[PDB]
């Protein structure tokens, strides 16, 4: 039970919560990669250079891609940042991003030392 493993278990706990029924009402747009073509967002990949979503974070966690909590947090925040960059701030998806990021930031702050 080394510090990095321990901190990544906390990250995995957060990830499970973000994917849980508890938060499904505002988390669901972040479950899978933005389907730009399907949503008619033909400028999405010109504006967003590094797409990110919770399925990609889950795949990277399962594959032991993340070496520390900082790397995991950078992907979760990239996902939110992409949402805030692309969308007008009054879009429903931005309100949902804000709510899910509140869940993330408050639990991430409870990281074991």
- State the minimum distance, in angstroms, from the CB of residue 23 to ligand ULQ: 14
Q: Which residue number, 99 or 107, has a Cβ lying nearer to ligand ULQ?
A: 99
Q: Which of 113, 109, 81 is nearest to 14 (CA)?
A: 109
Q: Which residue number, 29 or 105, has a Cβ lying nearer to ligand ULQ?
A: 29
- State the minimum distance, in angstroms, from the CB of residue 51 to ligand ULQ: 9
- State the minimum distance, in angstroms, from the CB of residue 91 to ligand ULQ: 5
Instruction: For tokens 């399962």, name the residue.
Output: 62
Q: How far apart are CA 83 and CA 61, in angstroms?
A: 22
- State the minimum distance, in angstroms, from the CB of residue 74 to ligand ULQ: 17
Q: Which residue number, 25 or 111, has a Cβ lying nearer to ligand ULQ?
A: 25
Beta strands in 13-87 (DSSP E): none
Q: Which residue number, 6 or 35, has a Cβ lying nearer to ligand ULQ?
A: 35
| Footprint of ligand ULQ (CB under 6 A) | 29-30, 34, 39, 41, 83, 86-88, 91-93, 96
Q: How large is the greatest C-alpha to C-alpha distance in the chain, in angstroms?
A: 47
Structure tokens that stand for 31 in this block: 């479950």
Instruction: For tokens 């509140």, name the residue.
Output: 102
**3-class SS of residue 27:** helix
């Amino acid at each position: 039970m080394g510090k990095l493993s321990e901190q990544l278990k906390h990250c995995n706990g957060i990830l499970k919560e973000l994917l849980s029924k508890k938060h499904a009402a505002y988390a669901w747009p972040f479950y899978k990669p933005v389907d730009a073509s399907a949503l008619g967002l033909h400028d999405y990949h010109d504006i967003i250079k590094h797409p990110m979503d919770l399925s990609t974070v889950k795949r990277k966690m399962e594959n032991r891609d993340y070496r520390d909590a900082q790397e995991f947090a950078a992907d979760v925040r990239l996902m939110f940042s992409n949402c805030y960059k692309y969308n007008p701030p009054d879009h429903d998806v931005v309100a949902m991003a804000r709510k899910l990021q509140d869940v993330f930031e408050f639990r991430y702050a409870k990281m074991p030392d």
